[PDB]
């Protein structure tokens, strides 16, 4: 348990860093909401805290943690700024996805930049064609979380021939200098995430920064004893677990806020001048809190399954991954229902622009509908695993 | 059934008016959201359509309808602009509340103004003291829906003596010329309702425009055959039923929108490229639709109970009113849960500023937490009626 | 509204009959539970009350009511004996189904027997082959509600040729003298319904007592002005609405019982020595009661849609029938969830054999899973109607 | 982690014992249901397996495990016989409660009987009066789980003086030879548990077998390094956690059964001839499974909190105990809702006496309403902890 102790010690330290830098992130909430991008101070704090480096390899100066640590960090980050938490989660996840690329690419990205920050969008395909020494890539990729502050982007594309017929799927790593960002992110939640559209036209991408779509989604590294444990982790599932953690954390912040304010407000137009005087209020809050507790456990269970497998160098069977997909959708669904309950508890005041409760409500609800967190898809995937049905998603 | 036919004919005509003027209200949504008040064109349309006049007496040129008609109008209005619907509902309800005042006041308000529009705020008390010929009134009343466009306001206050000791409760009718409006309405939903703060300082209010709080909440007119049936209606309960209708209508619009868009969108990242191809999606939508249908029936049942009693000139017993309070909270609770479900159905796109789905979601959620719609209070009131417990609210 | 008044008067009279004969049905609950059939006194009371005759034609001495009346009768019956209610509902529904047969069959059944009682099972197919003057029928039909007391049975079969190849579907009317009943009904709920297996071997059925399966499910009589309104009703949907009413009524009886007992019991091991002293208990009960109220409205809405169409001699479109299927599944689902809630309210004592609460719980739960009440199928059917998908059931 | 490994090894061995003896328990289900007591073979198997000895001290030849082990054993036991599981859980819990008594009593109970089996009923008070050398005890105690097979019983009583005035609360240990059992357990679930009434009349109980009620509920041993860790455990909370495990396990067995049968049955009257062909069915089952998974985690979390505190010799603060009370009520509530869902999945066949599904449904539902598992009380307790309100139960 020497390593177990070490990993726990680091997690605590990282959680304490979140608390230390949290007032900066909180301070920039108003500007972020207004401008739909993270303020400069927040980006600075992310680079100084090293919170973008949790899933970066030690060989490049990264912290190289595990899923559970990243999850606990994301939950605490959300208390201060759910958008920052979301971006930080996306960066670490993108960096982890980068590890499927060759060493040549990884050196080019992380070699002189321990704090390198990647975007990744699987939400579109662009079209790529072979050229000498690489590919020529054209496309338009929406939902590019944190792309304004990112150094590189992993983009999905379809390879085509001279005729324009489909050849196969690709994953491509392209630098900020080669990208253009189009202002398309106009939403009512997660505004500062800056999930704008990445645009490429006839852009050259060399061969060493391109892998097959099959390789990008591969879980063959699960049993590779040569790799450190983090790079054995099922990456896509891990990313989904930390996205759920962002949502979860916002829900938990919402709960803490309602608890904080309940002794000094009433329930109009009742005789209950203090919320805590109403037993209906108190018992309801207990129930809502237990749903959020359940969501937390679903997330932690999935994180632990992923880490245990990576540490033991075993492959997670499909049934276990299908269950993880169910856990994450179920956790965020539980959180959105609980937020609705917390607004009923708090009252009309919760919708004031000055009240953080509506911020958590809007950010968690927006983020929860991310595709990898879809509750109905998760339900169908987990249910299907009981009978060995063909999954309804292309990769796990 | 001659009258039954007549009342149905009028309702249909009014619903058709909503459709006719609806494109104007819809057109001003963006400005209303931006400015936190209804645009001039919307106010003009409200005055031309006579939709503020449903609960104004025929003797003054009003349409003098019933609860069910007002409810059906409110539901349809919400499709075009939930804020307009909310304001229109508040105006009619305020006008109905005005009927507790003496004829002298009613003549002063409606005598040369068939389209007079009242606000009413029970959300604060101001302090009033006797002066010769009336009272001197000071206070600050938040949540003044539609006050910027209103001609008069009904405000609650506490009478006090020279010593400053409490004497009793009052309801006071004061004109726009005597009011000041303070800009305090900064919310994330129902923005165009302009529910700002009304401020009064040492304002004179004459005796004929002041009644006891007891008289304002009175239901003694329930059995008065001299009055037309609308003025026999339990007014506070009626107002709550139409507030619920505003929320309900937004929910129904949300449902229609999700149905409209489902055949041309998919469920990422599944194999379902069309939402309608997924049986999980289809059956879930059926379930969500049945909750909204239940909310509609709760609202309609309460409206019908209120109208039947007014037409028959019978008093509703307390148990029936307590049940109505439960129905309205339960209906809006059902609607907010269903909206959460509709976002899961529609996906991440629902949170774009260009998508009406998030508008219905923000407006219905904000309005649902109005005090007269509190779901937990309603549950407690209805439950209590089964055992004859003392109600937890001061008036029914 | 002369007829409207008449129909309401009859319904009240029938409801009063249920109260009059209810103590007999209640008295035989223990024997019925023990023997898995209705006691002789109960059968006698059913014949004397004429409650099996609501959907029998006036021309044969039947009461010829409508769906709403049958529904309200079923709900009240369930308070005394849910099994009796279930049987009575099945008999009326079977009698209504009989009206698709030729006049020759109807005369043979009802001509000298105004109180004739039919079974009907669509739960199996038997196999029938042409013979001169009719058919020879062999099969085994489970779930034959009330078959032990029934005079005739409507059984579904597949016609086959000499080769044994399928020809088509049939509905066959066969008398008690020709049937054999096999003891197969061993259940933990609805025990006295006696839903045993009907067995036939090479039984002759004449031509006039056989119709096509297509004719049995037909709704062509919806527009026939020659028929009285009851025989224009969509029969299968009507039967499903009254089956739901049986379940609903049991739920309502359960609610009344929990209300009755709450002031004299406590909530162990809390300080609440009286259930009514606990506000959590009271507010929860209010919520449960509103779900049951919603189930009641779903049932009533469907009944009214069916009656309005029959009275106006219009065909219900498919979308309206699909909605009715959704309403009935949703109502019974709401009732089973509410029963679970009522057990939480009442406590461990609810599971004693002496407590009627567990009887309502077991009977409503068993009956709710009847195929025509399946909640998931109803959800899929209603959801599908929004997009005009092919229904997942063969007939509506 | 040497001990951690050891404790895990023992748990696995015990779980394997449950599987070995499980066919005996399963075999006696029909007799147990019929006779309302455990069959002789089942009692024999309980004694041979040593499953009553998990919470008996090592010093007396007991297995002396922890909460988590007992919980995992209870869950697996329920698959074979929920009544046996319930009895076994009650025995271990009673044996753990016995450890508050003096060494003299413990020696008298366990000294020559490593497999001693205790009952315990807190559901009544009897009345006890001082006599020389002890007390004279009279009372009637219902809900005496497993009393027919038990060697001793812990019974709660109120001490009174000669006048008959109340003096204080007592806990009394009395042997089978001194007890009389009255046949009062007539229920529709958990029938074989034989939770009959214990009757005592003027029975002598010596001083060394009597402690104060305060001492019986005490948690002062939480920090006593002299005691083994099991006897430092918060006993009443531990007992509630394993009662919940019995219910949980029945739910899990129900889930496994529905999964097992789904490929060979259909959903009447739909086109889905195989349940697994229906995506609505599959996704619903996934959701139901995730609720049961959440219930499992709630139970495991509480077990772990209790064990970690016992091993570290720290006292659990009140807030942690209040949370455990919430977890257990919430888990069983989740299980009863999920069982309702599983019946909808399986269909009408689930209510046949031959189907194990209705057995799990009846046993889990009956046991869930035990006072220490009340969901509404748990919600109120956990909610209250957030604000430090006075708990609504007398002990934690
Ligand atoms: C706040 C927020 C931030 C987001 N950030 C990102 C991001 O940084 N990167 C990102 O890729 N996505 C991001 N997403 C989006 C997610 O991938 C989906 O695109 C989004 O939920 C819209 O789904 P849809 O059904 O509207 O998708 P669509 O419009 O259907 O997407 C189009 C196609 O992309 C495929 N697709 C979409 N998303 C994914 C995915 N995650 N993995 C694989 N295939 C996919 C689908 O199969 C579909 O064919 C974000 C969503 C939100 C709400
Ligand atoms: C969009 C929106 C529009 C609203 N418009 C109006 C409006 O036009 N007029 C209006 O009066 N209220 C309005 N309300 C408010 C409602 O009455 C409550 O004031 C509000 O829900 C907040 O309650 P609270 O618990 O924060 O209590 P507080 O606002 O803090 O209430 C203070 C006191 O006012 C009393 N009180 C508050 N509301 C009422 C009421 N409706 N009836 C009787 N007593 C009351 C309470 O019992 C308490 O004593 C609106 C709310 C929303 C969200
Ligand atoms: C208390 C109770 C009483 C019942 N009484 C009756 C009764 O009097 N008559 C009766 O027919 N059924 C009755 N049913 C049963 C119902 O029709 C279904 O048979 C039952 O729900 C079992 O469904 P399953 O999926 O196990 O049926 P299955 O065993 O799958 O049924 C066999 C076949 O018949 C078809 N089928 C079954 N029921 C129906 C129906 N109602 N309409 C059309 N097709 C059907 C199915 O599609 C299937 O192909 C009763 C059920 C219960 C619980
Ligand atoms: C299957 C089953 C098995 C049970 N087995 C047992 C058992 O072995 N031992 C046992 O004590 N109870 C047992 N119970 C019962 C439980 O303790 C409660 O008595 C029961 O839940 C009924 O509660 P009630 O509200 O009807 O209150 P009543 O039982 O009518 O309450 C009587 C008094 O006893 C007190 N009381 C009851 N139970 C408890 C408790 N568990 N702890 C502290 N105080 C209590 C209550 O405060 C109340 O003052 C069992 C219940 C079930 C359903």
Residue numbers in the entry:
A (entry chain H), B (entry chain E), C (entry chain F), D (entry chain G): 2 to 397
Can I see the authors' text?
In vitro characterization, bioinformatics and structural investigations revealed that XiaF is a new member of the group D FMOs, monooxygenases that receive reduced FAD/FMN from a NAD(P)H-dependent flavin reductase and assemble in a tetrameric ACAD-fold composed of N- and C-terminal helical domains and a central β-sheet domain35. At the heart of the biosynthetic pathway, however, we discovered an unusual cyclization cascade involving the non-canonical terpenoid cyclases XiaE and XiaF22. Here we report the in vitro reconstitution of XiaF and a designated flavoenzyme-reductase, which jointly mediate a cryptic indole hydroxylation step that has been proposed to be a key step in non-canonical terpenoid cyclization. Accordingly, in the terpenoid pathway C-3 hydroxylation of the indole ring of indosespene by C4a-hydroperoxyflavin as the electrophilic oxygenating species yields a reactive intermediate (most likely the 3-hydroxyiminium cation 9, although deprotonation to yield an hydroxyindolenine intermediate is also conceivable) that is prone to nucleophilic attack of the exo-methylene group, resulting in the pentacyclic intermediate 16.
The structure of XiaF was solved at 2.4 Å resolution applying molecular replacement (Rfree=22.9%, search model: 4-hydroxyphenylacetate 3-hydroxylase, PDB ID: 2JBS48). A similar conformation of FAD has been previously reported for an FAD synthase from yeast49. This bent conformation is missing the distinct interactions between the FADH2’s β-phosphate and the amino acids Tyr144, Arg266 and Ala350. Instead, three new intramolecular H-bonds between the ribose and adenine moieties of the cofactor are formed (3.0, 2.6 and 3.0 Å). Therefore, it is unclear whether this unique bent conformation has a biological function.
